[PDB]
Design a protein around this ligand. Structure first.
Ligand SMILES: O=C1N[C@H](CN[C@@H](CO)c2ccccc2)[C@@H](O)[C@H]1O
Ligand SMILES: *[C@@H]1O[C@H](CO)[C@@H](O)[C@H](O)[C@H]1NC(C)=O
Ligand SMILES: [Zn+2]
Length: 1015
């Protein structure tokens, strides 16, 4: 295994180093506004050395943006694909590439068999070529790597089944900045080449000057280079025709033959296209070849890529004709005039890359190596696209919830083969496809129109219901005596109970367990643990009595805590935000212990008085002017006081001190250690009153943030043996700090209400001497070193925070883990900040045509980990990566993959069993079974189960921490007959494994295995 910590890779281009050196000046480059006037030597190409030009027709089809998926399908995409089939069929030299398989699958299934056969033939013969082959072209900033893999798999599995092809070239022309998670996944999925476009204009200029726009992109920790993937970065401002023929858009627009008038389009540079004729083809070809030769100066081989397309292009038959016929005339002229020394033709993306690598092999070019990322993107001036790291945060959080429910549903149902009448495969396919769709670069990004956001949300709600159905059917089967099991595949044996989605204050969605002497004495509940190690976690349920005790299913008592059910109210009469307690429902909390990838059953029983093993939290309401707070049968009376500082400690865990406004001020890790200053603060950013306005994409603040004016907020302190918390009703945020004995959990119920032109940020202020350095993650996969650059504006120093961020000095680290992707930064030494929501009246001129005024309450969740790191073995000062500690990684897992909770729906569960998975191996803490998916339906004689295994890398800090068992996924199901290593999509076998044993993977590696079973 390669060492991912101690060896700094030697690469030609390291993006953090590049950023430190670059000046980012925005000077007028001439017709290439962000470049320079490109010069070429006419004598470079000659009879013995021609320029080979591939013109690649394409159509960018957004799966929702200004219209919904289905609206675009009906109005645009079905016509594009129908006319592509016809025109490619009838014109054998024409070519076309296709990226978004969600649309292609929608189309193909509606085709008659004769047309399906015609479509298969133009794919098999190379005229129609799939590029990437994902369900979508995903966002790269907010997306979790697990969902990037999910959607890639969904599309490529479809393509293999129906088109008998698996793309090896990727096309990503529109995500708003680019992540190295993409080459990581793609290279482990059979890919050989990828293309990107939206990178900062200053990066394009710098790389173009050095001819470093084609590079071998490796991961930041990869010393050897085995992760490298050949990458082409496009050089200009857009993927549209004006910005793809060459550096002068006024010239290139004249070669977009859809712009002459009849189609409703024109050229903003005020020179229209003109139809190619024998009388103008020489002058037109002079202009076009000169653009091509200039573009070619930015690259190292004699093979040139010329994309030809734009959004929802190639719709009408007349458009196919006008582009094809005019380019054919140009090619006929150019290719017959030796003085140009050009051979130009329609091509596909794979054809381009094949010819590039033939030139490389012939010794014509050597390519540089590169590591790093391409955030934060700016397309022009100071217009940095950091807004969409936060826009529509409700749906960003929903993404992470659905991520986990898909994994849990696929895992729980994989243990068995299911009859078709159970509808398991059907529900899982629907769930995977709706989540996959949302990875689109107008879905999770929060950059679609209001009604499109609603469509995504409705789809994801259906997907959540599908997952719940599959999960509860699976639990019933896994925990019922087999000779008793009598399923009704339409019935709800269990309901899921989720304490954090949609969340307290967002939706009253949770069912109360109703117990009583005259109705029902007890109730079974079941917890699932999708992680491959034993896990303890506190779990809570709502119950109709405070007099409830917990037992395991050997009838052993389990210690429990009961707390009130508190609801925060924005009281329009008193003009205060204050909590009310229920007088009929209560929370019971207890520690569940659950096997690896397993299930554990508990029983909740009512009694007439306080049970022996159940304790009751105290409650203290700090406010001037209190009024009473009755709690029904709850046995401890609420106490009141004036606002004051408070301190709390649960178990042997840290001691946390809070201001009189209910906000953390210090953390003391152990009883004799310092009270380390750690202060939470809420602030607001505004919008500029002159110049460019923030919108769904762009963050254009009117200066540094200003503190929210808190007044004298109401603070609720709940103190229990198992769980304590401090909650405060601030303007726009009910902020909660929850303590269970380790790092606290932070929950913010964020309701930005009618605050127009406001962005609410949560900041942490510490005295950690972090200087200008901080760390953020990429797609939940890796942590990258960031350096704050005062030569760039504030918004340029914002980065995606898809799952966590940290700052550190020689001795101390503060890590904030998230349950949702949000934007954030460290704008000063010792600070961390993360945006909660943004409400923006204006459009930001990127095509959306609306502001962001559809905010709704969202429950954001976090873990806050303060640690001593002086004993940790860290990377050297020049290494571009960082790594979590064990405690921070487990805290992240606690947010993203919590225990699942199931409440038995009927009065008696006949045949109930106490546990599943007690014999599953408990794997080392850095290893995860990211995916477990049965790949065959029940009719297959040989069943196949796929696993994706990911090993992270955790710092060595002196904890001896060992004894675990080896996890061999190929023996998790009985009767194994073969074990194979596969690509991550499961679509290609890479190695037949001796002994049918799946080895574990190295740190920072991800592997896939498929086990086959004879029985
Ligand atoms: O958010 C998005 N931005 C892209 C914008 N495409 C460009 C045309 O190349 C466009 C800009 C403005 C209006 C319409 C279209 C869209 O593809 C969508 O994904
Ligand atoms: C699938 O494609 C391969 C060629 O890449 C071929 O060997 C096999 O026959 C194909 N099956 C078909 C044609 O459906
Ligand atoms: Zn797009």
């Amino acid at each position: 295994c390669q060492d991912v910590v101690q060896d700094v890779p030697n690469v030609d281009v390291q993006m953090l180093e590049l950023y430190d050196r670059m000046s980012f000046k925005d000077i007028d480059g001439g017709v290439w506004k962000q470049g320079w006037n490109i010069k070429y030597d006419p004598l470079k190409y000659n009879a013995h050395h021609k320029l080979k030009v591939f013109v690649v027709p394409h159509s960018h089809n957004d799966p929702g943006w200004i219209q919904t998926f289905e609206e675009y399908y009906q109005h645009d995409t079905k016509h594009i694909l129908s006319n592509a089939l016809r025109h490619l069929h009838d014109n054998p030299e024409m070519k076309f590439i296709w990226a978004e398989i969600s649309y292609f699958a929608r189309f193909y299934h509606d085709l008659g068999e004769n047309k399906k056969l015609q479509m298969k033939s133009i794919v098999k013969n190379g005229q129609l070529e799939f590029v990437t082959g994902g369900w979508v072209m995903p966002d790269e900033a907010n997306s979790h790597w697990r969902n990037v893999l999910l959607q890639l798999t969904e599309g490529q599995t479809w393509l293999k089944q129906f088109m008998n092809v698996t793309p090896t070239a990727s096309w990503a022309i529109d995500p708003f900045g680019h992540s190295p998670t993409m080459p990581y996944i793609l290279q482990k999925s059979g890919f050989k080449n990828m293309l990107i476009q939206r990178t900062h204009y200053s990066v394009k200029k710098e790389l173009a000057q050095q001819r470093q726009l084609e590079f071998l992109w490796r991961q930041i920790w990869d010393n050897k280079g085995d992760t490298a993937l050949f990458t082409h970065m496009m050089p200009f401002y857009s993927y549209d025709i004006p910005h793809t023929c060459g550096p002068d858009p006024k010239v290139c627009c004249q070669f977009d033959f859809k712009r002459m008038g009849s189609f409703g389009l024109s050229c903003p540079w005020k020179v229209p296209p003109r139809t190619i004729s024998d009388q103008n083809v020489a002058a037109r070809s002079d202009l076009l070849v000169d653009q091509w030769k200039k573009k070619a100066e930015l690259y190292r081989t004699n093979v040139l890529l010329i994309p030809l397309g734009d959004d929802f292009r190639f719709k009408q038959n007349t458009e196919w004709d006008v582009q094809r016929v005019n380019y054919e005339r140009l090619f006929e002229h150019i290719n017959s005039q030796a003085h140009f020394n050009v051979q130009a033709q329609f091509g596909t993306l794979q054809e381009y890359f094949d010819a590039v690598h033939q030139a490389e092999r012939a010794g014509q070019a050597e390519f540089p190596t590169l590591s790093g990322d391409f955030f934060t993107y700016a397309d022009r001036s100071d217009n940095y696209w950091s807004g969409y790291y936060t826009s529509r945060p409700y749906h960003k959080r929903m993404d992470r919830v659905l991520m986990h429910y898909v994994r849990a549903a696929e895992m729980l149902s994989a243990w068995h083969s299911w009859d078709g009448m159970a509808r398991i495969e059907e529900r899982l396919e629907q769930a995977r496809r709706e989540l996959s769709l949302f990875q689109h670069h107008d879905g999770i990004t929060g950059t679609a129109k209001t009604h499109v956001v609603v469509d995504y949300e409705q789809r994801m709600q259906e997907a959540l219901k599908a997952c719940q159905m599959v999960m509860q059917q699976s639990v019933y089967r896994l925990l019922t005596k087999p000779s008793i099991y009598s399923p009704d595949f339409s019935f709800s044996y269990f309901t899921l109970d989720d304490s954090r989605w949609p969340g307290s204050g967002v939706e009253d969605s949770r069912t109360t367990i109703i117990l009583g002497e005259d109705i029902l004495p007890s109730k079974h509940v079941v917890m699932h643990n999708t992680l491959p190690h034993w896990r303890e976690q506190l779990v809570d349920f709502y119950v109709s009595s405070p007099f409830v005790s917990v037992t395991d299913l050997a009838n052993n008592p389990v210690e429990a805590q009961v707390s009130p059910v508190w609801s925060w109210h924005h009281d329009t009469l008193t003009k205060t935000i204050h909590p009310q307690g229920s007088t009929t429902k209560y929370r019971i909390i207890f520690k569940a212990r659950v096997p690896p990838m397993g299930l554990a059953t508990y029983v909740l029983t009512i009694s007439d008085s306080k049970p022996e093993h159940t304790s009751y939290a105290s409650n203290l309401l700090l406010r001037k002017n209190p009024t009473s707070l009755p709690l029904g049968q709850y046995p401890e009376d609420v106490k009141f006081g004036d606002p004051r500082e408070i301190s709390l400690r649960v178990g042997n865990g840290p001691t946390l001190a809070f201001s009189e406004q209910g906000l953390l001020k210090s953390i003391q890790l152990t009883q004799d250690s310092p009270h380390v200053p750690v202060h939470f603060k809420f602030l607001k950013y505004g919008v500029r009153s002159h110049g460019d306005r923030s919108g769904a994409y762009l963050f254009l603040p009117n200066g540094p943030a200003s503190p929210v004016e808190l007044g004298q907020p109401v603070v609720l302190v709940t103190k229990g043996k198992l769980e304590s918390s401090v909650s405060v009703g601030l303007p726009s945020v009910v902020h909660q700090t929850i303590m269970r004995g380790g790092a606290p959990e932070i929950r913010n119920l964020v309701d930005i209400g009618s605050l127009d032109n406001t962005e609410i940020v949560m900041r942490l202020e510490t005295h950690i001497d972090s200087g200008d350095i901080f760390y953020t993650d990429l797609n939940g996969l890796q942590f990258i070193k960031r350096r704050r650059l005062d030569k760039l504006p504030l918004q340029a120093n914002y980065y995606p925070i898809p799952s966590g961020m940290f700052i550190e000095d020689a001795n101390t680290r503060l890590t904030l883990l998230t349950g949702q992707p949000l934007g954030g930064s460290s704008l000063a030494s010792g600070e961390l900040e993360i945006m909660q929501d943004r409400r923006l009246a204006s459009d930001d001129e990127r095509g959306l045509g609306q502001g962001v005024l559809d905010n709704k309450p969202v429950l954001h969740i976090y873990r806050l980990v303060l640690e001593k790191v002086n004993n940790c073995v860290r990377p050297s000062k020049l290494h571009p990566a960082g790594y979590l500690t064990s405690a921070a990684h487990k805290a992240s897992q606690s947010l993203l993959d919590p225990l699942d909770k199931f409440i038995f729906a009927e009065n008696e569960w006949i045949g109930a069993q106490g546990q599943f998975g007690g014999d599953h191996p408990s794997a080392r803490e850095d290893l995860d079974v990211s995916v477990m998916r049965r790949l065959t339906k029940s009719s297959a004689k040989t069943q196949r189960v796929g696993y994706v295994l990911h090993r992270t890398n955790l710092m060595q800090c002196g904890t001896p921490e060992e004894h675990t068992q080896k996890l061999d996924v190929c023996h998790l199901l009985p009767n194994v007959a073969r074990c194979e290593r596969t690509t991550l999509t499961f679509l290609q076998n890479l190695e037949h494994l001796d002994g049918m044993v799946a080895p574990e993977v190295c740190p920072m590696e991800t592997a896939a295995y498929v086990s086959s079973h004879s029985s």
